[PDB]
Amino acid sequence: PSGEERCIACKLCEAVCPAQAITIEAEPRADGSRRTTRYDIDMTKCIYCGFCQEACPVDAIVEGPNFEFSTETHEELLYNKEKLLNNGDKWEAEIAANIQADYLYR
């Protein structure tokens, strides 16, 4: 809620991804915080199994509820950190609503 990204570059989601669709590179930030410099998800390699969102210890990466995101070219399906952060800022309302509705079953 303060505005800082939840991801801490623990690389658990990368290690648990069955399809190896997540690529993470990190380094200390300007203020010494543990943050990522690269967070790529290849949507053409992902199998949408949800392991990444359940291996995350800080609820950083989530599998959103949007499904109408078809593309006319292969390149635009290779998400980087900027695209995923934009998706989070775009869907945060209903993403947080769903997380609140379901987190008691997890």
Binding site: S70, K83, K90
Partner: peptide, 21 residues
């Protein structure tokens, strides 16, 4: 949170172009 929702912008000069970060 975005104050202006954007529809799918594939095949548009606003489309997403991947690059190294």
């Amino acid at each position: 949170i975005w104050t202006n929702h954007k529809f799918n912008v594939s095949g548009t000069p606003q489309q997403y172009v991947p690059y190294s970060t």
